[PDB]
Amino acid sequence: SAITKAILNADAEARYLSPGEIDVVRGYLASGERRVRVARVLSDNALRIVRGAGDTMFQKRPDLVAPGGNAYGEVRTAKCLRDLDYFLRLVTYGVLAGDTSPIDEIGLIGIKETYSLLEVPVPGVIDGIKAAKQQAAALLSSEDAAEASFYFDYVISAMS
Amino acid sequence: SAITKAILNADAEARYLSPGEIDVVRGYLASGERRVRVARVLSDNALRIVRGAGDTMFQKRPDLVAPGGNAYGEVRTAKCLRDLDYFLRLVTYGVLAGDTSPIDEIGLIGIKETYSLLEVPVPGVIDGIKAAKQQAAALLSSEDAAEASFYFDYVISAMS
Amino acid sequence: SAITKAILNADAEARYLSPGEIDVVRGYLASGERRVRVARVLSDNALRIVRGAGDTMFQKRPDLVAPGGNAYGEVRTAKCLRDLDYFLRLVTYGVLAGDTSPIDEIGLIGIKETYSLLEVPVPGVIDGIKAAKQQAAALLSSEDAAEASFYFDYVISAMS
Amino acid sequence: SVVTKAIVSADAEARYLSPGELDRIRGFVSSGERRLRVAQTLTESRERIIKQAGDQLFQKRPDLVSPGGNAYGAERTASCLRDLDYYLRLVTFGIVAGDVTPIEEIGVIGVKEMYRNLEVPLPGMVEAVKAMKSVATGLLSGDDSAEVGYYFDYLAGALA
Amino acid sequence: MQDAITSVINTYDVQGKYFDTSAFDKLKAYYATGELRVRAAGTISANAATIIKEASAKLFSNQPDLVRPGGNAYTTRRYAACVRDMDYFLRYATYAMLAGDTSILDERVLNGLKETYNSLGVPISSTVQGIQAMKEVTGSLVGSGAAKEMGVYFDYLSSGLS
Amino acid sequence: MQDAITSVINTYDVQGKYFDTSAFDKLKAYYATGELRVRAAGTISANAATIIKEASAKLFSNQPDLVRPGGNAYTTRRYAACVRDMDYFLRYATYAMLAGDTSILDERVLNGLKETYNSLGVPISSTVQGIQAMKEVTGSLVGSGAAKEMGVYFDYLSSGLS
Amino acid sequence: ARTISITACVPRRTKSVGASREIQNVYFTKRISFDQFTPEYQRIHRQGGTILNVQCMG
Amino acid sequence: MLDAVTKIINRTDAEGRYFASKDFDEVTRFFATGEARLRAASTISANAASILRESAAALFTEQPDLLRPGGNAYTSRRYAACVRDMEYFLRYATYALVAGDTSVIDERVLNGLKETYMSLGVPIPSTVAGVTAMKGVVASMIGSEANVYFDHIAKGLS
Amino acid sequence: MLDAVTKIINRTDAEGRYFASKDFDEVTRFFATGEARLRAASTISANAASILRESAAALFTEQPDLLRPGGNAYTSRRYAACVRDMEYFLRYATYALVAGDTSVIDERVLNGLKETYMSLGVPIPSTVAGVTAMKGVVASMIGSEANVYFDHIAKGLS
Amino acid sequence: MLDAVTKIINRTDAEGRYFASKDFDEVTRFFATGEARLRAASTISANAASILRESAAALFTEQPDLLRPGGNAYTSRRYAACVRDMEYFLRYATYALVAGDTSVIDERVLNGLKETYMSLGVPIPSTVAGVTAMKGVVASMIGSEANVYFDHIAKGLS
Amino acid sequence: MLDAVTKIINRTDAEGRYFASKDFDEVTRFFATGEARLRAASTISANAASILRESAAALFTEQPDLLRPGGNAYTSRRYAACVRDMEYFLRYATYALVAGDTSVIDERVLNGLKETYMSLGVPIPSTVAGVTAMKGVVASMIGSEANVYFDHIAKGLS
Ligand SMILES: CCC1=C(C)/C(=C/C2=NC(=C\c3[nH]c(/C=C4\NC(=O)[C@H](C)[C@H]4CC)c(C)c3CCC(=O)O)/C(CCC(=O)O)=C2C)NC1=O
Ligand SMILES: CCC1=C(C)/C(=C/C2=NC(=C\c3[nH]c(/C=C4\NC(=O)[C@H](C)[C@H]4CC)c(C)c3CCC(=O)O)/C(CCC(=O)O)=C2C)NC1=O
Ligand SMILES: CCC1=C(C)/C(=C/C2=NC(=C\c3[nH]c(/C=C4\NC(=O)[C@H](C)[C@H]4CC)c(C)c3CCC(=O)O)/C(CCC(=O)O)=C2C)NC1=O
Ligand SMILES: CCC1=C(C)/C(=C/C2=NC(=C\c3[nH]c(/C=C4\NC(=O)[C@H](C)[C@H]4CC)c(C)c3CCC(=O)O)/C(CCC(=O)O)=C2C)NC1=O
Ligand SMILES: CCC1=C(C)/C(=C/C2=NC(=C\c3[nH]c(/C=C4\NC(=O)[C@H](C)[C@H]4CC)c(C)c3CCC(=O)O)/C(CCC(=O)O)=C2C)NC1=O
Ligand SMILES: CCC1=C(C)/C(=C/C2=NC(=C\c3[nH]c(/C=C4\NC(=O)[C@H](C)[C@H]4CC)c(C)c3CCC(=O)O)/C(CCC(=O)O)=C2C)NC1=O
Ligand SMILES: CCC1=C(C)/C(=C/C2=NC(=C\c3[nH]c(/C=C4\NC(=O)[C@H](C)[C@H]4CC)c(C)c3CCC(=O)O)/C(CCC(=O)O)=C2C)NC1=O
Ligand SMILES: CCC1=C(C)/C(=C/C2=NC(=C\c3[nH]c(/C=C4\NC(=O)[C@H](C)[C@H]4CC)c(C)c3CCC(=O)O)/C(CCC(=O)O)=C2C)NC1=O
Ligand SMILES: CCC1=C(C)/C(=C/C2=NC(=C\c3[nH]c(/C=C4\NC(=O)[C@H](C)[C@H]4CC)c(C)c3CCC(=O)O)/C(CCC(=O)O)=C2C)NC1=O
């Protein structure tokens, strides 16, 4: 979390929170209402976002669901949609936390070698997450959409 | 002691005591009677040495025992005299051991942090220890006083 | 052995056996029959090799068994010939293993300290081992003699 | 020397010399005249020391000067005796220095490698150094004999 | 490092000779001055902080621009480093005086010091002035013979820098 | 380090070419000499201490002032350092002979060695004489064809030091 | 002085996995001097590790 | 370590579910109390040396035998180590006040502390009394807001 | 570590005798089996990625609750580590298959593994299930030539 | 480590009092015995290699099984480690003899030594026999001046 | 430029003092070394071509890549400039040896040399290696009398 990062910075120097760290924590606490609003909108609309992103991704990359595709079959396609749901939930976690530590800890550390070992196409995942970003931005206001897009883009850059 | 320091040295190079270290141990055992005499004089005269050193220190620095001073009050003045007594007994230990190791172990390591956090003026402690050094030299011959002054100035230099 | 060295080299790099390592293992396996033949000839004739080596060494250096010699007496001469026997056995071990690792682990590591503490003349040992190598070369064919001489010269070089 | 050792020990700790180190140096410099007298005594009798030492060594190790020996012949025996001269001069250096440092750098570090490269047997060296001890401590009074015996014991241990 | 005794030892070892009358005179001369050196070293060690306070105060009084802004000794860090370097010079002069030989000043101090100071921008003339200030302050504590001895090593440092 | 094989691979890779008949001739020549090289390496490793003993004996016989006081090999420490230098020279010469290539001598031995010897005071001409002694003894041990092969790397070291 | 034996478990949860052997530095028992104890205590805590056992030899 | 938001996040990640109404409620309560906790922490930090001095004085007034020869706090070194442990407690309870979670106390403070003290001979009840004294001194300045973290430390030792 | 020849050497060295006819026979038998073991090891190496992939799939089809939120294999990092452990097991079983003796498994793999999994929380029976699935895949691809080493890993775990 | 003088100083510091008459008497007793202790230590040091050689010979004549194949002293490596350990015991007993106190033997030798020997499989009764043989040799050379330190080693190993 | 006498004169003038005894002694010491320095300078001047030849040979034996295509010494012009630079170093080090002061090197050689080399891509560590090789050759001929001056040039490039 933002608070956790400030406290770890203080702890590494065996000191108290510096004025910069206090100002950071105050700004993070001030941003709480808009963070909660964005996360609640994304959480209430998770099924819509994931279904729409999956639809767009399979419409742009039909090979994945076709026979011989990585997501071919009902079970494997369900796992693909579940991964999109995982990444949307991680985006909401990062939005609430004010940093990307939950996203890294839960979902990104090791994801790249995981997908490479499972033959999962990372361009496909990136397309799905971009579709999820668009679906989320459709449900959010432009200012809130930018805040969510920060974390959607963080996930995309982690994969790319 | 001197013996312990020579043994530690020989042990670091994993060898028996060398001619120089035998000379150190022999010259220390030779000085035993003189060290015992000096320690006896300093020990039996601890009360008057501490009374005189405290009187001199307080005359030199009245603000310590003035209101708002670190030593103001019966309890704080008593602890001040007790610290002077502690340092005198440590000096006796250093004379007996033929090295400063007991003084470091019991009194010096951490005394700077202790006195900084308790707001104890280190120059005042130095003044009291100098007063104790002259009061001891009054009680000893020139050679015995020179022997004790080594450890007194060692304490003072560790302070400063 | 050769196999153990190949495996350890592969394990240090956290990888499977490389084609060069696989060639090493395959070549050692192919040589196994010749290695067994040499080791069997050496083992079946240990008494005569050690006896001839001891006689040659003691003839070259009668002082080792003269009064005041390191191997003087029946007990110490028996220990001497036992040492030569140990080195012959370790040579068979190294011929079989395809490397010098048994020779190092069982008899080479620490031998310099042991003999120096016991005042065993290392040149005497080297003369005895060279005599044993000549005895072995007598019983073996030229290629077999070269193969055994590799590990004999390894022992000699390790002592000197 | 004692002074150089104390200074280097203090310097690796970025401190001024302690009362113990200064006491060591005082004991060293007050012993300087006696040390110089003992060094003069051993220098005066250098040729006699070397001659009876070589006599005893070759009497108790006749193989050295017998055919095949390391010191066999006239020039090799001369080199043998020149080594004892080197080591006696090192002992005098170490006596004036107050420790075995000059001995250690000039004559102890690397000696095993050098007598291996020269085929000089080290038990012979130890016997020769012990013979020099006996001859040289025969020439001094009670305290000086033990003091010089310590340096000779240092050599004997370092050669063994 | 090399002290006076090991200096004699090295000369005689290199030329391969036992000590003669001349070596014994040099060694007697060193031993005779030993008590004065030990006394001076104990006095300097007991007073080192006071010596540094006085010398730094005299230096910064004579050159106030060092500790004002734009000076090389202007910050708490650079002031602390300045008096730290003065602690070096006092401590290594005390070592060289106790050893009776300047070899430690070559090995442990002067080697590369001009290059360090010229790379840092540290003014070397002001450093020599500070060394001189320590020389007078130390001489004020140790007395005639010890002052004359310590001044040799202070001047060696000054010459090595300047 | 590069061997003969890797030297050929380096040329053809920087030229981006497949092996042609000339490359196969060169690689074939290395494979042909491989058995001789292996036998010479085994002989040298078996006799390494004897080689160092005989060669240092020759070097200190021709230049006896090296081991007397004032020589650069007078002390046990400096004598040991000298024979250790000779041992390393012999082992790297054997490496280069096995590889059929002097690259390991450039990469591990020669670079900065002359400047180090100059800074320490090691007499470089005497070092070259010791290397020549090791060459003569080694060539006596390993036979004529191996002598020609091994002397090339011995001379490479001698020229690098001269 | 005195030596203290610390048995600790220090996971790798802050970074990605690797093929190299890693088990020995993750779970370990070492004793260190008293003056090194605080730095090692804090280093174990900082890497998310757990201190399992503390003993004073003697 | 965890703060309150990451603790709620780790819980929801344990069920693998999005934030529901109660989770957002906990988060918004934490955001509401953040400013008060920040002011309490700044107050503690501003008076750190004073709080530590008073708390050490209280500890050693109630248990004078800790300082007497033979007591665990009798030397300059052992007294300094005692006061340094109390400084740790103050700093990390302040960290936990800012975070809103006693995690940092568990990972960075109480983890192995009890075994360390027992292996060293440090008396646990005297350290608990010191934590209680420090708690009282802090609550005399910032109110009852840091009480839970000092209680957590004391029970972790207890 | 030991191989079969070195193990026979140690057995001859403990009792301090030269190799006898039985010892030479055992060594000769090990040399006779070398080509098949080498080809098996090469077959495992050339298909290591596949073997790992379907062995992980077999484990997680057998026990899907490992992957579920709250399971020990639920995160990208923990799944990575699970598959990495299975890679450890495959590579070291192949080492033991080339060596012909299981000492490398005992020193590099099984040494302290159970304690480390208890401390970490990795379920031993599920890890053993993964080891058995990997054994099944390896035996399907090369035959029964590697079963002893996988059984050794499993027994050392359970 | 502690010598006798530092042991006395530690007692007086634990009691918090200056040196009294009996303490100075104990210190004077140590200073009185110091010269004889130095002579004995110098005698041991001068003949350390010889002492070690007959002590090893006495132990291995007493227990020839250790040198036989399958014994703990059977290899050049394990023989070297055994004589190395005996040299440790001799040198540290000499240290304790000079220091007048057995502490250095405790924190430098006996601390964790039994656990080390069980982990290695070293026969402790045989090590105690080696210490006893060393005791006999040293007593034959210098007298009974070092007996208590060798007894301390033997009892701390038992 | 300055020499030793002018350096001492400027030092005495910065203090506004006359020459003291120590200053006269320093000037006398400089005058005493004049004959050896002049013979050394003449020896260098007589063998300048050989010194440069062996220095360049040593440089390019150490680093043959410099002469290969794409090296900074690869062309007739670039090799010419390299040997001309070393010739400048030799002549100006001889000047500084005669003067006894390194000011001529600072005035005529290091006046923008490092900036010039960094701008042109002249490899400075290789240039320093060449300067040090020339130092070695000059020392082999005349001894250490010139070493410091060569070191100055190296320090001017680093
Ligand atoms: C909460 C943290 C977390 C993440 C992120 C995660 C991803 C993840 N997806 C997996 C499989 C999979 N992942 C996908 C998804 C891919 N298929 C399509 O091509 C798309 C491009 C793409 C998704 C957008 C598919 C189809 C599989 C099944 C592949 C197989 O089992 O062979 C696996 C291997 C184990 C399993 O089958 O569940 C992981 C670990 N798991 C986690 O515990
Ligand atoms: C045996 C080794 C040892 C030492 C060295 C030692 C010093 C020491 N002095 C202390 C307090 C004190 N020390 C002093 C002494 C000062 N008063 C004046 O200012 C003078 C400048 C100066 C003495 C000359 C005073 C007044 C206190 C009480 C301060 C307070 O209560 O906050 C304390 C804090 C705990 C206590 O109250 O006792 C320590 C640890 N304690 C030890 O166990
Ligand atoms: C299997 C590994 C192994 C090796 C290699 C080994 C060598 C060995 N030989 C020893 C003694 C000995 N070794 C020798 C033999 C030497 N002296 C003669 O002069 C010859 C030059 C030379 C033999 C060719 C002798 C005479 C002794 C007895 C020395 C003594 O105890 O005083 C000892 C000391 C223990 C003892 O036997 O009393 C060892 C460790 N021991 C091992 O367990
Ligand atoms: C930009 C960072 C910086 C600082 C802060 C700094 C402080 C500083 N204060 C100095 C003197 C001084 N500073 C003080 C200040 C003290 N008087 C009372 O005690 C107060 C507690 C306290 C001030 C509130 C005094 C009295 C002196 C004169 C001390 C003396 O000469 O003995 C000096 C010595 C030279 C001079 O007088 O200019 C420095 C360098 N230097 C720096 O480079
Ligand atoms: C100052 C430190 C120092 C020492 C000590 C030293 C010893 C030394 N002794 C040598 C020769 C020798 N040294 C000896 C001595 C041995 N002969 C018997 O075995 C005895 C056990 C023993 C002497 C008591 C002999 C016989 C030689 C001649 C070797 C030969 O001819 O090859 C040599 C070879 C060079 C020469 O002969 O001049 C050295 C370097 N060198 C040093 O720089
Ligand atoms: C070569 C010898 C070797 C072994 C054997 C070894 C095992 C091992 N596995 C680890 C992590 C792990 N290991 C697993 C294994 C999985 N957990 C369950 O889901 C599965 C049933 C099971 C595998 C089939 C997991 C999930 C972790 C991560 C645990 C965590 O970080 O919380 C760790 C902790 C360090 C790290 O995270 O990399 C070790 C030491 N390490 C070694 O160096
Ligand atoms: C940031 C997390 C952290 C903690 C919690 C921590 C506690 C801690 N306290 C220690 C010692 C100590 N702790 C104390 C304090 C106790 N003794 C007094 O009597 C009091 C009752 C009481 C304190 C209120 C003392 C006296 C020692 C010294 C032990 C000794 O040397 O005998 C040590 C041993 C290391 C050392 O002293 O250098 C640790 C690790 N260290 C850490 O890095
Ligand atoms: C100075 C402090 C210190 C001590 C005390 C110490 C003891 C010690 N002895 C060891 C091994 C050993 N110790 C022995 C000695 C035994 N063999 C038996 O036959 C004898 C009866 C008996 C001795 C009299 C042996 C044989 C080993 C080798 C064990 C092995 O490698 O299998 C080891 C294992 C590490 C190594 O091999 O170097 C230690 C730590 N080490 C230290 O640093
Ligand atoms: C009298 C005072 C004086 C000095 C000191 C001097 C040095 C000097 N060397 C130069 C170029 C150069 N210097 C070098 C030398 C380098 N080549 C590398 O391989 C070597 C490591 C190294 C020499 C040891 C080279 C190759 C150039 C030409 C660079 C270019 O033109 O690209 C230049 C740039 C202009 C020119 O090319 O002439 C100067 C000014 N010139 C002067 O008038």
Author numbering:
A (entry chain A), B (entry chain C), C (entry chain E), D (entry chain D): 2 to 161
E (entry chain K), F (entry chain L): 1 to 162
G (entry chain M): 2 to 59
H (entry chain H), I (entry chain G), J (entry chain I), K (entry chain Y): 1 to 158
Describing publication, verbatim:
Phycobilisomes (PBS) are antenna megacomplexes that transfer energy to photosystems II and I in thylakoids. The A. panamensis PBS features a configuration comprising two herein characterized linkers and presents a paddle-shaped morphology.
The cryo-EM map illustrates that the heptacylindrical core comprises a pentacylindrical core (A, A’, B, B’, C, and C’) with two additional core cylinders (D and D’) on the top. The two top core cylinders are assembled with ApcA1, ApcA2, ApcB1, ApcB2, and ApcC1, in which (ApcA1/ApcB1)3 form all trimers except that D3 and D'3 are formed by (ApcA2/ApcB2)3. Interestingly, ApcA1 is not in the same clade with other ApcA and ApcD subunits, and ApcB1 is not in the same clade with other ApcB and ApcF subunits. The lack of orthologs of ApcA1 and ApcB1 in crown Cyanobacteria suggests that the top two core cylinders were lost during the evolution to crown Cyanobacteria. A core-core linker, ApcH (LCC), connects the top and bottom cylinder complexes. However, unlike ApcE, ApcH does not have the pfam00502 domain that binds PCB and anchors the PBS to the thylakoid membrane. Instead, the N-termini of the two ApcH copies attach to the C and C’ of the pentacylindrical core, leading to the giant heptacylindrical core and expanding the overall light-harvesting cross section. Overall, the top two core cylinders add 48 additional PCB chromophores to the core, thereby expanding the absorption cross-section for red light. The top core cylinders (D/D’) are essential to connect the energy transfer from the chains and the top side PC hexamers to the pentacylindrical core.
